[model samples]
Target: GGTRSAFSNIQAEDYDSSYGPNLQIFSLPGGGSAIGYIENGYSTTYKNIDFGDGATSVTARVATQNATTIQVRLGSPSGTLLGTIYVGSTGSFDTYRDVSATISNTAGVKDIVLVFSGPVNVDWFVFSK
Candidate 1:
């Protein structure tokens, strides 16, 4: 195949919610809501996404002051390992931080899941061009 870049910005609140454990949509400070209360040992999947060629990077907007890690996976829940984003303590749950990672490349109208190793909050994961 070939390769390119995608400037896709998928919103967490814009999607239908979640399919993992303890996942909830929390109201953000800007009159919008983001997915939160993501407990450890849980994974969140955003499905039905079509990458033109593929995505090179993934940027996640997250909040909550917790020591956690987010693994961005392409394909299925345990598919192609993209990269990991670290969620350090930000002193509060409402304070959002954009964490991202660079993957080799990926595509299709498949599911991209964020697997957490510890408790944390999340907003949206953007696939960058």
Candidate 2:
């Protein structure tokens, strides 16, 4: 609904819009949430994301049983691809770790889209300059 700084932890379950048939939001045990049931062709959108002057990389907290890839795009779902983050298994769906990827062409405010390429559980993602 408004502009968001990429430096802040952007919760995966808090996507402004989504494009996928199986994406689901799951509640955490203690107090948070995550987006699960993510597979290839699924994409999540975060609106009005401001990357500041520039950003070097993005980090996502994810848990998965198999290796996966996340494509960071801008503007739209199939917009400019800034980078791709390859994520390895974190033992189980409940186990989480931070995976990072170097990104470019992400220095202004725009809608950011994440395209998934395999099964994974995403808790949150953030960007740094």
Candidate 3:
């Protein structure tokens, strides 16, 4: 009925070297899945995540830059729009708010695209069913 933070007060640099955009895939308790990641100023704009078969999918993007918006899209090639999460342009390097959504499809979700509207960076992202 509610939600819980996948991570605590964790900084982006703390897990930057060992993390990438593909670390968002997660498994549920019963035939479900999820994923998350951080969209930094990297070459890859989108990351492919698998949510098993017939399961829900949630994506989280933590912005680490100013004047930037991360785009989260569902499906593949022609995925639907979930929404956009606005990250603060100026402030302490804190955990940017987590953006998440549910996927109704059971055939399985194909991709989660993170597009930076401005010169921004992402810290973390997550997806779950």
Candidate 4:
């Protein structure tokens, strides 16, 4: 089999598994689902993510009435922080926008955690070089 790259896009509601209370998956108006009801300290992990060579940044589609920060971490909620994504409102809860941030590079297959600083909704996220 071929290797997986860190640049692969991951759907927010498609996480492999989780520990602690998980966020609710809401149906998107345009067809599809998104993870919502995100609260402070809420976290989820995408397991066995292959960073391949490496990555330097990440972009996420998110929305919130106010604003929030999604801490990109490795291993656990208190894991190694790769970066922090600053999310702003795109008008409403159903609306979304792309938010990006710089991140550290680390090559290997490992789990990645998305930890929220406050209330927000996530559509998806992509890692990039």
lDDT per residue as tens, model 2, 1-129? 368899999999989889889889999886799999987889999988888898889999999999989999987767989999999999899999999999985787878899999899999999998
What TM-score quantifies how close candidate 1 is to the native fold? 0.80
lDDT of residue 94 for candidate 4:
75
Order the candidate numbers by TM-score, best to worst.
Answer: 2, 4, 1, 3
**Candidate number of the best lDDT:** 2
Instruction: Sort the predicted structures by lDDT, highest score first.
Output: 2, 4, 1, 3
- For candidate 4, give the lDDT of residue 82: 88
* lDDT digits (tens) for residues 1-129 of candidate 1: 332223556677654334565677778777777877777767776666766677788788777676788887775556887788877787778787787778768766556677778767676777865
Q: Which ten residues in a row have the lowest lDDT in candidate 1?
A: 1-10
Query: Model 3, stretches more than 4 Å misplaced?
Result: 1-47, 53-67, 75-79, 90-109
TM-score to native of every candidate shown: 0.80, 0.95, 0.42, 0.90
TM-score preference between candidates 3 and 4, better one: 4
TM-score of 2: 0.95
> Looking at model 2, which ten-residue stretch has the lowest summed lDDT?
103-112
Residue pairs in steric clash, candidate 1? 64-93
lDDT values for all models: 0.70, 0.90, 0.42, 0.83
Q: List clash counts for every candidate, in order.
A: 1, 0, 19, 0
Q: Who wins the TM-score comparison? A: 2
Candidate 2 vs candidate 4: which has greater lDDT?
Answer: 2
Local distance difference test, candidate 2? 0.90
